[PDB]
Design a protein around this ligand. Sequence first.
Ligand SMILES: [Ca+2]
Ligand SMILES: [Ca+2]
Ligand SMILES: [Ca+2]
Ligand SMILES: [Ca+2]
Ligand SMILES: [Ca+2]
Ligand SMILES: [Ca+2]
Ligand SMILES: [Ca+2]
Ligand SMILES: [Ca+2]
Ligand SMILES: [Ca+2]
Ligand SMILES: [Ca+2]
Ligand SMILES: [Ca+2]
Ligand SMILES: [Ca+2]
Ligand SMILES: [Ca+2]
Lengths: 10, 282, 270, 241, 269
Amino acid sequence: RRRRRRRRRR
Amino acid sequence: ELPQMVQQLNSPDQQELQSALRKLSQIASGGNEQIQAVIDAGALPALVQLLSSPNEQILQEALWALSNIASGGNEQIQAVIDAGALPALVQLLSSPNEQILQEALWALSNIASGGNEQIQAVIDAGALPALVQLLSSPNEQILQEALWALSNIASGGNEQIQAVIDAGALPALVQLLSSPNEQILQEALWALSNIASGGNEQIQAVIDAGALPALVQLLSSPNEQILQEALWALSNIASGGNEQKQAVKEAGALEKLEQLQSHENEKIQKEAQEALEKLQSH
Amino acid sequence: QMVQQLQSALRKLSQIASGGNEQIQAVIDAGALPALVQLLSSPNEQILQEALWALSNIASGGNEQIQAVIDAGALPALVQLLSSPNEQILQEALWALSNIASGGNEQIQAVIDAGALPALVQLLSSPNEQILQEALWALSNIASGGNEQIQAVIDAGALPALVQLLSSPNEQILQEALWALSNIASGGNEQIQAVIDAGALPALVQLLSSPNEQILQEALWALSNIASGGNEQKQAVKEAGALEKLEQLQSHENEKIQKEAQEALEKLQS
Amino acid sequence: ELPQMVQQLNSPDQQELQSALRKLSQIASGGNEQIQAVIDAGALPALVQLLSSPNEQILQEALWALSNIASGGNEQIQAVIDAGALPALVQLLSSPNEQILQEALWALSNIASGGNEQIQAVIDAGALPALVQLLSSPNEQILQEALWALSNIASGGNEQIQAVIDAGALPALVQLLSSPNEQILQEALWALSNIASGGNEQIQAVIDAGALPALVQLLSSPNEQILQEALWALSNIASGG
Amino acid sequence: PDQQELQSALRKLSQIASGGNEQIQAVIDAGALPALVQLLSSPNEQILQEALWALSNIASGGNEQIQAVIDAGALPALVQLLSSPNEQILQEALWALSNIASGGNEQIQAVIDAGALPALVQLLSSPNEQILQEALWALSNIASGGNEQIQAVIDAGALPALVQLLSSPNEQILQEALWALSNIASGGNEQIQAVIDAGALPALVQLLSSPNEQILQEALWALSNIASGGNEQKQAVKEAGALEKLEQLQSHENEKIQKEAQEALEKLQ
Ligand SMILES: [Ca+2]
Ligand SMILES: [Ca+2]
Ligand SMILES: [Ca+2]
Ligand SMILES: [Ca+2]
Ligand SMILES: [Ca+2]
Ligand SMILES: [Ca+2]
Ligand SMILES: [Ca+2]
Ligand SMILES: [Ca+2]
Ligand SMILES: [Ca+2]
Ligand SMILES: [Ca+2]
Ligand SMILES: [Ca+2]
Ligand SMILES: [Ca+2]
Ligand SMILES: [Ca+2]
């Protein structure tokens, strides 16, 4: 169900 | 059956429609191959059509699917643009519904993660004025979402970067460098670094915006994470429009920077003569 | 995968539900939680989101993994963060809190005893649809427990806000509110009646006139759980004028809808 | 003007050869459209043959040109593979010439930066055994370059990740977690994180190798840069596949 | 006709030679260097790389910018890093130095005064081809200054090692070694003589028989600078047997070779 997450490198 | 879903995207049965949507979001995930299969089945026209829906439940999942599709290759991103999704996404940036706003910014940033062709389409759709407005938001969640999208846009060519500048983004960015919120500082420095990765014209705008005093102040920070982020940006500023000495905030940028050192030599051969000759003609 | 599910059908679905718990447990055995919990008191927002990310992943394991998170003393900090004006910190804590509350009744009770409901309930009135979704998710998990956990939700004063949201012109909000209410109404007759006394039936019946098949399906599950109560509860449903609309739906064109309207008229028997 | 240079890649005049080789490198560094023009002109067969050259001056600039061609899209990477460059590339990983070794590792890293199909070709060509050995190198420059190429390979599917594990990369990676060199530490954690971004099997290998004790120790670091790196890796492990 | 293309070209000179110096100076005027210099003593290899990236960029500007880096006190730490067993640190320190040594004689002399040459010479005997290139490049930029600067190199003992490299079967090492010697040979007759006293001519003449045109171009470039000395220097060249080689090369298939050989031969007499 509708949960989102994200991250970044360099 | 994939066409069955595509067919069911026009169903007036909201329960049958919502099932085909979430299932499409599932298919859009799992690689560009499944993304392409969705594209080939002819779903995009009905998908984009639902972006004008006043049904937030349908709109949300629709944006979810479009974002997954937009996570594919530039070719697959360009299909989303061709389908005509940008004008609707841009208008949704003015929504007071934070849930919709996140999904709209998510899709838009994925589109801006492609090539300059795709980035320029975002710009030509009028997305920057809304993004800039959001930089003044007291909602840290909205702020991250807007900086993520701006960062991707500023990762393109100098003309893309310049569009960002002309939209008035720098004043807001500079003010955020004073924040005690390390998370906001990271996001703001991320965007700045991409902007400073342009030409001399673009770098000068950063300087004219008063970025250096804050960047310099952070060099004294005992936080090694802040230090790296501040040094990254300042290093791009001190590049002198030379892209071989710049690095866009992305994986493989620092490694590429190192490799170019051992090949600028023949490129440095002609700069030294340009220096001697110009001096000898005082 | 969990969706797609003589006794080998049982064991397969275990392996799916528990996939990854053994890995998460090793992290715990290594002693990662004390440090993570320590980092929850940092004024550095960047460190916080990083520690909350890891903690949430750990809290995504089994009940034993979740209980280790509780035994490490994470809830007091998490609870504190629910009153933050930083919408970014708020989403991160609710995520971790939801995962913890997604465990067993013992885990849900720890969330309750830590004082999470008051903050969760006050967020229900938020004009921020993003926060609202996160608060409802966490509340739905808490309301998925036993009658004691459900009643704690009621005693916290959640129902007034939930009933108000049923009138929302936002379908997504409506789904979220109906799921939470559906969880509350899955408890004993004491809990169902509380839903009734809060004025849920009038709004639910009004939704049965909706042309939106997704809304009907959502409202049908709530009433269905209400109709599983006692005669006092079934009667109130009849008083509100549910039977009328239900049989008006007895022949709806959607197969799945028909079974829900059927199975409801069934329950209303005595 | 492009087919001219390609034919000059077979010239017996080294000065005429080097000049054409340097301009091709410059064209390939100018975007995918410039990269495709080079491919269409038929340069890859000539470039691939120069990977056998005993002239280090030529080889390096040929490696440089191929690295740029490999920086394009997955379609342009695959052309490099189809041309048959990987065997000659992988062979150069055993070179004692640090100058040539670096250039080779960059090309492979770019190749491994494509799709899982491209990563697999690198694996099937036998690139992993060499890379692993380089992890024991006392040369921090070599170590960084080897860890990068490995990180790109470990960014693929669980099959690609498992290939890395089966090659014996973990024991060396774990030792690097004790390094007082923050630069080595970042490089090792990046690779380790990718591996931990796989399925439960791949995650469990990371655990069986003894990574957690060091990781947990790093959580007490006052260095916020190290902290972020260690948490990232720890989170992937605790994702549960 | 003149002025437009004269200024369009003149304008282009300042951009390829000084494109970006105004921005780099703004960074300096903001006070970035003291902090940057403060970080070069850190034992954190990660911070060091990040600082060195910025300095090298700042030091890639004009002599004014480079000088500011020097006035800030950057060389002592840099020279100190030239002895690091960390190949990664060394690369970074050398690149920064190379940019500093790419300025004017005042900047080059500062590098000399800081004591960089002894470490650089030491590295010339390295079996690491990566380090050798870096040391040679920094050394080549020092040897691009005035005669006092070139002598510092000679007085530091760089010629013996440079001559040994001329026997290298590695064509890349050979190009690098010849470029450094070429810069040394561009000085005065005193400097040209030291090169001859170091035995460069026997090797250079041997290379003139190479079937590799690229080598020939590089070897000819070096000899031509030797040929631009006094009479006693021309004599040693002739005593070494170069004339016969140059006479056969003025009819070479490759044009750029015969031009280089022709021009060299005209210098000898
Ligand atoms: Ca339609
Ligand atoms: Ca609506
Ligand atoms: Ca803070
Ligand atoms: Ca706020
Ligand atoms: Ca709102
Ligand atoms: Ca309908
Ligand atoms: Ca030849
Ligand atoms: Ca990859
Ligand atoms: Ca070493
Ligand atoms: Ca250290
Ligand atoms: Ca610190
Ligand atoms: Ca060697
Ligand atoms: Ca050779």
